[PDB]
C-alpha cells in the first residue's frame, strides 16, 4: 500500500503528456509527429518503440 | 544427554526469531503512519488551484485524452480511487 | 597431564588471548624439546591468534632462556614468506578484467579510474604482477585528483607480504625523491602499511618520522595529502602492538584540524590501541567528536572510538547510549558499530534487539 | 512592486463558501480559492 | 579467501573482522577502499621439511573431487 | 496607535531567528539579546514577518541602566522598507527566560519610534510550557485592583502560530518527526489524550499556590485573576443532574455502533481467509504436477 | 595540478530555507536576488548559515542591477551586532521555470567564484516547489579547462557520487553546458528542532472538549446508513470468486473501487473517531467534577 500511492502522487507529478500523430518516416530513424494543437515537432523515436 | 547440550546453544537462536516477532509490531507502526502521510500529499495535488477541463473519452482506464481551457490539449494519468464511471459521458473535469 | 594433545591447549590460548597460558605451554616442551612438536605449534599460534599476544610472549621467552629457532617463528617472521611463495606459483591473470577496463573505461574521469584501483589490488594479490600495470600503464597515468591516490595505493596490496622486497616496491614513489605531485607520495605511504599490514614494527620506525615532521602544519595542501596517507599507514602496520607513540603524535594532526588528515589520525589512533579497552582513548575521541565542526573528522573520531571499544561486551554500554542519543548523523553512525564489534563473533540477543 | 498585478474575472458557479470556480479575461476557467479578507456575501454568482 | 574465523585452532582472529568493517566503509570517501589485506586469508597446505623452514614438494591424498577449472 | 491587537501569530522565521541572535551575540548567563520585530500591524491579528537584532546591552545591577543604540534602527528600518513592503517596526522581542517588571522602562522609551503602540514579545530560548514557550503582551494602562495607583502593566494576548503557505511546506517536510501540529493513527490520538490531561493537572497546581501565597505571604489581591476564577465555580458542573443522564443515552449509542462497526470487520477478515483457503488448494495441485510431468521429460533422456 | 576542483555538498540550515523562500515566492514573478552568509571549512562541506534579501528588479538579475551600497550597509551593521561572517554565495529566484540558468546568471555567478574560489548560487523555483525542498538545486561553475582536459567529474569522486534530480530535462541541460549540480542536504541543531516545531497551548484544550452532540447523532445516523448501500454490492461481487484473473473480478460485477476495500475503510475509520468520542467525553466528565 505504501509503494502504490507513492507511485501515484508520481505520475501527477511528471509535467504532463501530449498527443500527436506520425506523418511520416524519415531514414534517419526519426519520424515526423503532428502534435494535435500545436505544430509539428520532428523528433528521434524513443528507445523502446522503433 | 547429547541433544539437550546441544539444545541450549539451539535455544539462543530461537530467542533471536522471538526478536524478530517483535521487530515486525515495530516495523508495522511506522509503515500505518506513514500510509496517510504519502496519502495526504496526494489531497493537496486534489484541491485548489486547479484548472478546468472537459474530459474527452478514456484511452485505457487509468490514462486519459482531455482538452483544457488552456488552450491545448494533453494525456494525463487519471488518480485511482475516484469514479471512473462517470468519464465515459463527456462532461467537465479538473487537471491540477 | 603429562600426555595430551597440545592442538586443543592452543584452543584455550587463542580464545582467551593470554600470553601467561602461552608461555607455559612452551615451559612443558622446554622439558620436553623436540624441535618438531615446539614449532609446529608456534605456527599454528602466530596464524589464529592476534599479533598482539605473540609481541607480549616473545619478551618473556628471551627471558627464560630458549632456541632461536622458536624465536623467529613467534615473531612472526618466516609465517609471511611461506604465503608469498606459494602465491608465486599458482597466480593466475584475468583477460576479463584488462579487456572491459581497457576498451570501455577511462582513467579521464575519476570516479571509474578509482573502481578499476580498487580491483587491481584484489586480483594479483600475492607476489608482485607487473602485467597489469604495464599494459594498463597509459591508463594509470592518466588520472587526476584522489583516483591518482588509488592508483599507487594499489601497488602495495599486489605485492602484499615480502619483507626483502616490500621497501623497494616504493623506493621512487616515496616522499624525498618524488615531487610529481602530492597524492603519488601519500598514496605511497598508505600503500607501505599494507604490504606490512599484520606485522611491520620495522615500517612503523620510519612513518613516525613522516608523522612528527608535518605536526602543525596542513595549512598547505601538499602537507595534507601527504599526511593523510602517512597516519593510515602507520595505523595498518602496527595493528595492535600497543605504542603510545603514535597515540601521542597523532593528537597534534587532530587537534591542528587537519581537513583529510585528522580523518586519518582518528583511525590510526585506535588501530594501535585496540581492544585495550583504554579509559583514555575513548574519552578524547569523543569530547573531539562533539568539538570539532568539520565533519570528515567526526566521521573518523566516531568509527575510531569503535574499534577501542573491539571485545568489551557489557563495559561498552556507557558509550554506546552517548553516541546514539546525539542528533549528529556522524555519531549515531559509528555508534551501531560500536555495538558490533563488543559483541563481534558470537551471537548476542541484546545486540540483535538494539539495532 | 512588491505588491504585484492581479488578472479579473468572474464567478462562473459558487461552489463552495470559501472555494469559488471562475472565468478569467484571459480566456481560461479557473477553479480557485478564496482569501479570509475579503467577504463571502460580496461573492455571489456573476459578480466581478 | 576470507576467513571470519579460521579451523587451523577453530578460534576467532580479530584482524578478520576489521578488515571488513574498514571495507564496507567507504561512502563519502571512495579512495579508501583497500583494507581487504587483513581479510583475505590464504589457502594452502604449506610444508616443513623437517627443522629447515624449506618447503618440501610431495604427494599427498585427496578424497574428492577432481575439478575441471582453478584457472 | 493601536486598539486593535487581539493575538500574534508568529511564523517559525521569526522563532528560530531570535534563538540564534541569542547564541550570535554571545549573550547567555540571564542577559538579554533584543531585538526588533517586523511585520505588519495596526490589525486584529498582528504578523510578525521577520525579525533583526539590536545592538543591546544591561547590567542587572541596576536595571535602570542599559544600551540601546539610537543609529542603528534608523539604518535598518530603511534596508527592510526595501525587501519586502510589508516590514515595519511593530515592537521588540525579549529573550525571556521570564517578564521582568524591567520591561516596562524600555517599553517606554521604545514607544517613540513606533507608529503603534510597541509589543513586548517573549520568545523563550530554552522551551517551557505544555503550551508554547512564545507569550505575547501588549502595553496598556489601568488602574489596580487596590482602586489605587493607575499603573502601566502588560496584557497578555494568546498566541497560536502561524506561517504563510509559502514557509509552511518546507516546515512539514523538514521535520522529521510525530509532529504536535499534525498526526497520524488513533495510536497517536490516545497520546494526545494524556499529554492534553497531563497540562491540565500541572495548571491547577498554579492556581492553588497562587491562592496559598495570597492568604500567607500575602501579596497584594487583583479582583481580575480572583474574578475570574469566581467565574470557574458557577460554570462547573455538578453531579446527579439530568444533564448526566442524558450523556449516558448517547455513550450507549456510540459503543452499540461502534460494537456493529467491529462485527463488520470479522466478516472482513472472514473473506481474506478464504481467499488463502481457495489459494492453498490450487497452489497445491498445480506443485505437485510438476513434478510428475519432469519425471517423464526424464526418462526419455535415459531410455536411449 | 593546483586545485582539486570539487563541489561541496551544501547544508542549508532551517534558518536559512524559510527566508529564501518566503522572499522568492512574494516577489515572484520578477527575478529577485540577495547574498548568502555562512562558513566554509573542508573542501566537501560549505554552510548556509544564514541570508539576507537584496532589492528588487525587473530587468532580471544582472552585475549591473545589484545595490552595493546596500550590501555595505548591511555588513556595517553586522559589525555592530558582532555577528559578521564572510559571504560563501549568492541565491536567486527564477520566476516562474524550472533550475537551469540563463546566460545573465552566468555573468553574475562568475564573480561570486572570483571573491570567493569556492561559492554556491542556490535556486529556488517556488512555483514548482510544493514539498518546500523541490525545485530546489545549488549549482557551482564549470571551468573551461574542466571540459577539454576531462577534471569536470572530480566532485563524483570523494562525495556521495549520487544527484537527485528534481528536474529531469532542465538540469541535464546545463549538466554539460555550463554548470554541475551536485545534491543539497538540510540540517539543524536539536535546540532549532524543537522550536520550528512547537508545542501548541490549543493541543491541551482540544483534548478536553468533547464536540457538539448535534454533530455527533448526525455523524452515527449519517454512517451507518451510508453503508447498507455498499454491504448489498458485496455480496454481489463474491457471487463467484473462484473465476481468474483480478480485473476480471471488477468487470463482471463492478467491482471497480472494490466494495470490500471500501465499506472496510469506512468501517475502520468511523470506528476510529468514535472510541476517541466516547474517551474524551468520559474523560471530562469524570475529571472536571
Known amino acids: 500500500k505504501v509503494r502504490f500511492i507513492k507511485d501515484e502522487l508520481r505520475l501527477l507529478q511528471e509535467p504532463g503528456s501530449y498527443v500527436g500523430e506520425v506523418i511520416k518516416i524519415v531514414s534517419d530513424k526519426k519520424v515526423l509527429v503532428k502534435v494535435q494543437p500545436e505544430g509539428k515537432y520532428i523528433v528521434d523515436v524513443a528507445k523502446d518503440i522503433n | 544427554s547429547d541433544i539437550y547440550f546441544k539444545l541450549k546453544k539451539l535455544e539462543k537462536e530461537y530467542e533471536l526469531l522471538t526478536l524478530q516477532e517483535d521487530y515486525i509490531k515495530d516495523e508495522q507502526r511506522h509503515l500505518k503512519r506513514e500510509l496517510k502521510r504519502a496519502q495526504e500529499e496526494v489531497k493537496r495535488i486534489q484541491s485548489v488551484p486547479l484548472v478546468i477541463g472537459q474530459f474527452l473519452e478514456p484511452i485505457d482506464q487509468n490514462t486519459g485524452i482531455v482538452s483544457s481551457t488552456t488552450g491545448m490539449s494533453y494525456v494525463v494519468r487519471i488518480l485511482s480511487t475516484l469514479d471512473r464511471e462517470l468519464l465515459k459521458p463527456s462532461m467537465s473535469v479538473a487537471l491540477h | 597431564m603429562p600426555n595430551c594433545d597440545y592442538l586443543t591447549l592452543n584452543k584455550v590460548v587463542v580464545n582467551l588471548n593470554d600470553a601467561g597460558l602461552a608461555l607455559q605451554l612452551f615451559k612443558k616442551l622446554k622439558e620436553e624439546n623436540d624441535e618438531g612438536l615446539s614449532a609446529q605449534i608456534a605456527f599454528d599460534l602466530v596464524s589464529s591468534a592476534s599479533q598482539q599476544l605473540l609481541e607480549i610472549l616473545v619478551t618473556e621467552l628471551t627471558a627464560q632462556g630458549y632456541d632461536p629457532a622458536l624465536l623467529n617463528i613467534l615473531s612472526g617472521l618466516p609465517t609471511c614468506d611461506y604465503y608469498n611463495t606459494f602465491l608465486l606459483n599458482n597466480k593466475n591473470i584475468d583477460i576479463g578484467l584488462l579487456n572491459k577496463s581497457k576498451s570501455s573505461l577511462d582513467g579521464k574521469f575519476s570516479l571509474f579510474h578509482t573502481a578499476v584501483s580498487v580491483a587491481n589490488g584484489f586480483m594479483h594479490a600475492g607476489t608482485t604482477d607487473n602485467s597489469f600495470i604495464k599494459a594498463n600503464l597509459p591508463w594509470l597515468g592518466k588520472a587526476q585528483n584522489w583516483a591518482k591516490f588509488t592508483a599507487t595505493a594499489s601497488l602495495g596490496v599486489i605485492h602484499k607480504g615480502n619483507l626483502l622486497e616490500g621497501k623497494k616496491v616504493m623506493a621512487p614513489y616515496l616522499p624525498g625523491s618524488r615531487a610529481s605531485s602530492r597524492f603519488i607520495k601519500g598514496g605511497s605511504l598508505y600503500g607501505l602499511g599494507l604490504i606490512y599490514a599484520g606485522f611491520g614494527r620495522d615500517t612503523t620506525d620510519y612513518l613516525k618520522n613522516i608523522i612528527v615532521e608535518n605536526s602543525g602544519t596542513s595549512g598547505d595542501e601538499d602537507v595534507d595529502v601527504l599526511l593523510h596517507g602517512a597516519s593510515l599507514g602507520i595505523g595498518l602496520a602496527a595493528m595492535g602492538s600497543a605504542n603510545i607513540e603514535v597515540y601521542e603524535a597523532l593528537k597534534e594532526v587532530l587537534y591542528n584540524d587537519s581537513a583529510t588528515s585528522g580523518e586519518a589520525a582518528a583511525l590510526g589512533m585506535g588501530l594501535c590501541m585496540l581492544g585495550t579497552g583504554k579509559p583514555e582513548a575513548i574519552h578524547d575521541m569523543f569530547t573531539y567528536s562533539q568539538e570539532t565542526q568539520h565533519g570528515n573528522i567526526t566521521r573518523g573520531l566516531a568509527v575510531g572510538l569503535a574499534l577501542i571499544n573491539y571485545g568489551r561486551q557489557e563495559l561498552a554500554d556507557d558509550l554506546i547510549t552517548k553516541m546514539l542519543a546525539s542528533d549528529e548523523s556522524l555519531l549515531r553512525y559509528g555508534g551501531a558499530f560500536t555495538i558490533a564489534l563488543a559483541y563481534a563473533g558470537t551471537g548476542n540477543n541484546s545486540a540483535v534487539k538494539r539495532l | 512592486l512588491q505588491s504585484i498585478g492581479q488578472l479579473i474575472g468572474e464567478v462562473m458557479k459558487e461552489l463552495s463558501e470559501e472555494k469559488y470556480i471562475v472565468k478569467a479575461s484571459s480566456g481560461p476557467r479557473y477553479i480557485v480559492g478564496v482569501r479570509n479578507s475579503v467577504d463571502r456575501s460580496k461573492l455571489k454568482k456573476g459578480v466581478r | ?71 | 496607535m493601536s486598539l486593535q491587537h487581539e493575538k500574534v501569530t508568529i511564523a517559525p522565521l521569526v522563532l528560530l531567528s531570535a534563538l540564534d541572535h541569542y547564541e550570535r551575540t554571545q549573550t547567555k548567563e540571564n542577559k538579554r539579546c533584543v531585538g526588533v520585530i517586523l511585520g505588519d500591524a495596526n490589525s486584529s491579528t498582528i504578523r510578525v514577518t521577520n525579525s533583526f537584532a539590536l545592538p543591546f546591552e544591561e547590567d542587572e545591577k541596576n536595571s535602570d541602566v542599559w544600551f540601546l543604540d539610537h543609529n542603528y534602527i534608523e539604518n535598518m528600518n530603511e534596508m527592510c522598507k526595501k525587501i519586502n513592503a510589508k516590514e515595519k517596526l511593530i515592537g521588540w522581542y525579549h529573550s525571556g527566560p521570564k517578564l521582568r517588571a524591567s520591561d516596562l522602562k524600555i517599553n517606554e522609551l521604545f514607544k517613540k519610534y513606533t507608529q503603534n503602540n510597541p509589543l513586548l514579545l517573549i520568545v523563550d530560548v530554552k522551551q517551557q510550557g505544555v503550551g508554547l514557550p512564545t507569550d505575547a503582551y501588549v502595553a496598556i494602562e489601568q488602574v489596580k485592583d487596590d482602586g489605587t495607583s493607575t499603573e502601566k502593566t502588560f496584557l497578555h494576548l494568546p498566541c497560536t502560530i502561524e506561517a504563510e503557505e509559502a514557509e509552511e511546506i518546507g516546515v512539514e517536510h523538514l521535520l522529521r518527526d510525530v509532529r504536535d501540529q499534525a498526526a497520524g493513527g488513533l495510536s497517536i490520538r490516545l497520546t494526545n489524550q494524556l499529554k492534553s490531561l497531563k497540562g491540565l493537572q500541572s495548571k491547577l497546581k498554579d492556581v492553588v499556590e497562587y491562592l496559598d501565597k495570597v492568604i500567607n505571604k500575602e501579596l497584594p489581591i487583583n479582583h481580575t485573576i480572583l474574578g475570574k476564577l469566581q467565574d470557574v465555580f458557577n460554570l462547573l458542573p455538578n453531579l446527579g443532574t439530568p444533564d448526566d443522564d442524558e450523556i449516558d443515552v448517547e455513550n450507549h449509542d456510540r459503543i452499540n455502533i461502534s460494537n456493529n462497526l467491529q462485527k463488520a470487520l470479522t466478516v472482513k477478515t472472514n473473506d481474506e481467509l478464504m481467499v488463502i483457503y481457495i489459494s492453498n488448494l490450487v497452489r497445491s495441485i498445480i506443485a505437485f504436477d510438476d513434478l510428475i510431468e519432469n519425471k517423464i521429460q526424464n526418462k526419455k533422456i535415459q531410455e536411449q | 595540478t593546483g586545485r582539486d576542483d570539487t563541489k561541496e555538498t551544501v547544508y542549508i540550515s532551517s534558518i536559512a530555507l524559510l527566508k529564501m523562500l518566503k522572499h522568492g515566492r512574494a516577489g515572484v514573478p520578477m527575478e529577485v536576488m540577495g547574498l548568502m552568509l555562512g562558513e566554509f571549512v573542508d573542501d566537501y562541506t560549505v554552510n548556509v548559515v544564514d541570508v539576507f534579501a537584496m532589492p528588487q528588479s525587473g530587468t532580471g538579475v544582472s552585475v549591473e542591477a545589484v545595490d552595493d551600497v546596500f550590501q555595505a550597509k548591511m555588513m556595517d551593521m553586522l559589525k555592530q551586532t558582532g555577528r559578521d561572517q564572510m559571504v560563501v554565495g549568492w541565491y536567486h529566484s527564477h520566476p516562474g521555470f524550472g533550475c537551469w540558468l540563463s546566460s545573465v546568471d552566468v555573468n553574475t555567478q562568475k564573480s561570486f567564484e572570483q571573491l570567493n574560489s569556492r561559492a554556491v548560487a542556490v535556486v529556488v523555483d517556488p512555483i514548482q516547489s510544493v514539498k518546500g525542498k523541490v525545485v530546489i538545486d545549488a549549482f557551482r561553475l564549470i571551468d573551461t579547462g574542466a571540459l577539454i582536459n576531462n577534471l569536470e567529474p572530480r566532485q563524483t569522486t570523494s562525495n556521495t557520487g549520487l544527484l537527485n534530480k528534481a528536474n529531469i530535462q532542465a538540469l541535464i541541460h546545463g549538466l554539460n553546458r555550463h554548470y554541475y549540480s551536485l545534491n543539497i542536504d538540510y540540517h539543524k541543531t536539536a535546540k532549532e528542532t524543537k522550536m520550528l516545531m512547537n508545542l501548541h497551548k490549543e493541543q491541551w484544550q482540544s483534548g478536553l472538549k468533547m464536540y457538539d452532540y448535534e454533530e455527533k447523532e448526525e455523524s452515527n445516523l449519517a454512517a451507518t446508513k451510508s453503508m447498507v448501500k455498499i454491504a448489498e454490492q458485496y455480496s454481489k461481487r463474491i457471487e463467484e470468486e473462484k473465476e481468474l484473473t483480478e480485473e476480471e473480478l471488477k468487470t463482471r460485477y463492478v467491482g471497480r473501487q472494490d466494495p470490500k476495500k471500501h465499506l472496510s475503510e469506512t468501517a475502520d475509520e468511523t470506528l476510529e473517531n468514535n472510541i476517541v468520542s466516547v474517551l474524551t467525553a468520559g474523560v471530562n466528565s469524570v475529571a472536571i467534577k
Open chain 5, 1 to 71: 579467501t576470507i576467513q571470519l574465523e579460521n579451523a587451523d585452532t577453530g578460534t576467532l582472529d580479530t584482524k578478520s573482522v576489521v578488515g571488513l568493517v574498514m571495507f564496507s566503509q567507504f561512502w563519502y570517501w571512495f579512495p579508501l577502499a583497500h583494507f581487504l589485506s587483513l581479510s583475505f586469508t590464504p589457502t594452502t597446505v604449506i610444508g616443513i621439511r623437517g627443522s629447515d623452514q624449506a618447503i618440501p614438494k610431495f604427494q599427498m591424498n585427496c578424497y574428492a573431487k577432481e575439478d575441471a577449472f582453478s584457472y
